[PDB]
Amino acid sequence: QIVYKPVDLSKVTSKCGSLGNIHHKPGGGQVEVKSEKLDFKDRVQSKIGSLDNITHVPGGGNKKIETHKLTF
Amino acid sequence: QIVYKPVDLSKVTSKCGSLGNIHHKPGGGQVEVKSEKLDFKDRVQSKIGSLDNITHVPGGGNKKIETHKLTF
Amino acid sequence: QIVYKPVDLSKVTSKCGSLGNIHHKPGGGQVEVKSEKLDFKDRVQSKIGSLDNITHVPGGGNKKIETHKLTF
Amino acid sequence: QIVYKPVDLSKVTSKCGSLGNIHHKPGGGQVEVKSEKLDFKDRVQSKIGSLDNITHVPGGGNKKIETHKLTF
Amino acid sequence: QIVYKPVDLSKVTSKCGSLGNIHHKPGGGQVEVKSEKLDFKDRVQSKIGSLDNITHVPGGGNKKIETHKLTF
Amino acid sequence: QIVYKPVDLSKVTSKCGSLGNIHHKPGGGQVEVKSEKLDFKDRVQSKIGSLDNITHVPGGGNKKIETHKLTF
Numbered sequence: 001q002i003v004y005k006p007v008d009l010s011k012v013t014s015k016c017g018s019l020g021n022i023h024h025k026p027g028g029g030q031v032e033v034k035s036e037k038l039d040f041k042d043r044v045q046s047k048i049g050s051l052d053n054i055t056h057v058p059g060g061g062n063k064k065i066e067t068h069k070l071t072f
Numbered sequence: 073q074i075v076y077k078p079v080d081l082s083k084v085t086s087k088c089g090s091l092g093n094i095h096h097k098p099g100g101g102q103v104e105v106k107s108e109k110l111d112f113k114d115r116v117q118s119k120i121g122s123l124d125n126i127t128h129v130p131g132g133g134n135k136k137i138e139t140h141k142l143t144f
Numbered sequence: 145q146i147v148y149k150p151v152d153l154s155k156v157t158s159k160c161g162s163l164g165n166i167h168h169k170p171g172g173g174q175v176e177v178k179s180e181k182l183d184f185k186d187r188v189q190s191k192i193g194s195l196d197n198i199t200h201v202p203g204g205g206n207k208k209i210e211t212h213k214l215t216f
Numbered sequence: 217q218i219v220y221k222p223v224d225l226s227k228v229t230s231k232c233g234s235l236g237n238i239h240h241k242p243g244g245g246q247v248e249v250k251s252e253k254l255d256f257k258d259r260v261q262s263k264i265g266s267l268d269n270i271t272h273v274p275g276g277g278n279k280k281i282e283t284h285k286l287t288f
Numbered sequence: 289q290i291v292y293k294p295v296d297l298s299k300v301t302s303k304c305g306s307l308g309n310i311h312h313k314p315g316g317g318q319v320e321v322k323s324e325k326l327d328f329k330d331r332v333q334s335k336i337g338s339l340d341n342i343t344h345v346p347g348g349g350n351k352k353i354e355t356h357k358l359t360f
Numbered sequence: 361q362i363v364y365k366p367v368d369l370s371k372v373t374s375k376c377g378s379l380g381n382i383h384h385k386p387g388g389g390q391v392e393v394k395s396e397k398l399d400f401k402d403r404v405q406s407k408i409g410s411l412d413n414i415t416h417v418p419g420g421g422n423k424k425i426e427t428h429k430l431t432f
Contacts, residue, residue, distance in 0.1 A: 001074065002074045002142070003075045003076065003077065004074075004076045004142060005075075006076070006077065006078045006079075006080075006140055007078070007079045007080065009079075009081050010082045010083065011084070012084045012135075012136050013084070013085045013134075014086045014132025014133075014134060015086070015088070016087075016088045016091055016132065016203045017088065017089045017091075018090045018091070019091045019092065019203075020091075020092045021093045021094070021164075022092065022094045022129055023096070024125070024127040024199075025095075025097050025246075026097075027172075027244045027245050027246035028100045028243070028244025028316070029098075029103075029172075029195070029243050029244045030100075030102045030103070030244065031102075031104075031121050031123050032104045033106075033107075033121040034106045035107045035108070035109070035110060036109060037111075038110050039111045039112070040110075040113075040116070041112070041113045041114070042115075043114060043115045043116070044113075044116045044118070045116070045117045046116070046119075046120075047118070047119045047120070048120045048121060049120070050123070050124060051123045052124045052125070054124075054126045054127065054128075056126070056127070056129070057127075057128075057129045057130070058130045058131065059131045060131055060132045061130025061132050061133045061202070062130075062132045062133065062134045062135075063135045064135075064138075065137045065138065066138050067139045068140045069141045069143075070141075070142045071141075071142070071143045072144045075145075075146065075147045075148065076148045076214060077147075077149050078149065078151075078212055079149070079150070080152045080210075081153050082153065082154045082156075083156070083157070084156045084157075084206050084208050085155070085157045086157070086158045086160075086204025087158070087159045088160045088203035089160065089162050089163075090163070091164060091203045092163075093164040093165045093166070094164065094199065094201055095166070095167045096168045096197070096199040097167075097168070097169045097170075097246060098169075098172075098246070099170055099172040099244070099245050099316045099317050099390070100172045100243045100315070100316025100317070100388070101170075101174065101175075101195040101243050101244070101315050101388060102172075102174045102195075102243035102313060102314070102315040102316065103174075103176075103194065103195050104175070104176045104177070104193070105176075105177045105179075106177070106178045107180075107182060109181045109182070110181075111181070111182065111184070112182075112184045113186070114186045115186060115187045115188070116190070118184065118188070118191075119190070120193060121177075121193045121194075122193070122194045122196060123196070124194070124196045125196070125197045125198075126196075126197070126199065126200075127199045128198070128200045128201070128202075129199075129201045131203045132202070132203055132204045133204050133205045134204045134206045135206070135208070136207075136208045136209075137208070137210065138210050139210070139212065141213045141214070141215075142214050142215075143216065144215075169318060169390075170318070171317055171318045171388045172243065172245060172315045172318065172389070173315050173316070173387055174315035174385060174387045217289045219293065220292045221291075222292065222296075222356050223293070223295045224296045224354070225295075225297050226297060226299065226300075226352070227298075227300070227301075228300045228352050229299070229300070229301050229350075230301070230304075230347060230348025230419060230420050231303045231304070232348065232419045233306050234307070234308065235307045235308065235347050236308045237308035237309045237310070237380075238343065238345055239310070239311045239312070239313075240415075241311075241312070242313075242316075242341045243313070243314055243388075244316045245318065245411070246316075246317075246339075247318075247319045247337050247338070248320045248321070248337070249322075249337040250321070250322045250323065251323045251325070251326060252323070253326070255325075255326065255327045256328045256329075256332075257328070257329045257330070259331045259332070260328045260334070261332070261334070262328065262332070262336075263336070263338070264336045265321075265336070265338075266337070266338045266340060267340070268338070268341070269340075269341045270340075270342045270344075271343045272342070272344045272345070273343075273344075273345045274346045275347045276346065276347055277347060277349045277418070278346075279351045279352070280352045281352070281353045281354065282355075283354070283355045283356065284356045285358070285359075286359075287357075287358070287360065288360045289362070290430075291362065291363045292364045292430060293364065294366050294367075294428055295368065296368045296426075297368060297369050298369065298370045298371070298424065299370075299372070300373075301371070301373045301420070301422075302375075302421075302422060303376070304376045304379055304420065305379075306378045306380065307378075307379050307380060307417070309380035310380065310382045310415065310417055311384070311385075312413070313383075313384070313385045313386075315386060317389045317391075318388075318389075318411070319390075319392075319409055320391070320409070321392075321393045321394075321395075321409040322394045322395065323395045323397075323398060325397045326398050327397070327399045327400070328398075328400045328404075329400070329401045329402070331402060331403045331404070332404045332406070333404070334400065334408075335406065335407045335408070335410065337408070337409045339411045340412045340413075341412070341414075342413070342415065342416075343415045344414070344416045344418075345415075345416075345417045346418045346419065346420075348418070348419055349418025350420045350421065350422045350423075351422070351423045351424070352423075352424045352425075353425045354426050354427075355426065355427045356428045357429045357430070359430070360431075360432045
């Protein structure tokens with residue numbers, strides 16, 4: 001007999017009064033990559049040769065992550 | 073007999089009165105990479121040759137992570 | 145008989161009156177990497193040759209991590 | 217009685233057997249300048265706030281400069 | 289009586305068998321300048337706030353400078 | 361009576377068998393300058409706040425400078 005019965009009533013919350021006046025200003029750059037062969041198998045995530053700029057300004061941006069597992 | 077019955081009532085919380093006047097200003101740069109062969113198998117996460125800039129300004133940005141496991 | 149019954153009532157909290165006037169100003173730079181062969185298997189996380197800049201300014205930024213395990 | 221009679225018979229010369237395989241590769245950068253007032257008079261040469269790249273490969277590039285003056 | 293009669297028969301010379309395989313690779317950078325007032329008069333040469341890169345590869349690049357003056 | 365009669369028969373010379381395999385690789389940097397007032401008169405040469413890179417590879421690069429002056 002198994003009674004798998006977890007209970008969650010928890011909270012993740014925020015208040016912010018004002019959000020702004022943010023400046024992101026990159027000055028370029030240079031990237032070089034050389035290879036002869038690539039061979040990727042079975043759940044590969046790959047990034048080769050990048051020059052990436054990100055500005056991320058969510059009003060909340062809170063995260064909650066859950067995982068339930070039962071195995072025989 | 074197994075009675076797996078955890079209980080969660082917890083809180084994660086924030087208040088911020090004003091959020092701003094943020095300046096991110098990078099001055100370029102240079103990157104070089106050389107290989108003969110790449111060979112990736114089975115749950116590989118890879119990053120090769122980057123010049124990446126991030127500005128991240130969440131109004132909350134709080135995190136909660138939970139994990140429940142039972143095994144026979 | 146097993147009675148796995150933990151209880152959580154905890155708080156994680158912040159108050160901030162004003163957050164700002166932040167300057168991030170990197171002065172470039174240079175990176176070089178050389179390899180013959182790369183060979184990655186089974187749950188590899190890898191980063192090769194980078195010049196990466198991050199500005200991270202959460203209004204809260206609190207973390208809570210939990211893990212429950214039972215095994216036979 | 218002034219006899220002003222300079223004589224020039226001189227030479228400036230070069231040989232180069234082969235000229236090439238030159239790589240110029242700049243990685244960005246950042247420049248900022250602030251002023252309230254500017255006031256320039258009478259033979260001013262000025263340069264304010266620059267990010268300049270030059271490649272100069274003349275097959276000779278030899279120079280000769282002469283100046284003759286007589287004054288009463 | 290004045291007899292100003294200089295004589296020049298001089299030589300400036302070069303030989304170069306092969307010129308090349310030159311790499312110029314700058315990694316960015318950052319410059320900031322602040323002023324209230326600038327006031328320039330009468331034969332001023334000025335440079336304010338720069339990030340300048342030069343590659344110069346003349347096949348000869350020889351220089352000769354001459355100056356003759358007579359005054360009463 | 362004045363007889364200003366110098367004679368020049370001089371040589372400036374070079375031989376080079378091969379010139380090359382030169383790498384110039386600067387790693388960025390940072391410069392800041394602050395002033396209230398600048399006030400320049402009569403034959404001023406000025407440089408304020410710079411991050412400048414030079415690669416100079418003349419095949420000859422020889423220099424000769426002469427100056428002849430007579431005054432009453």
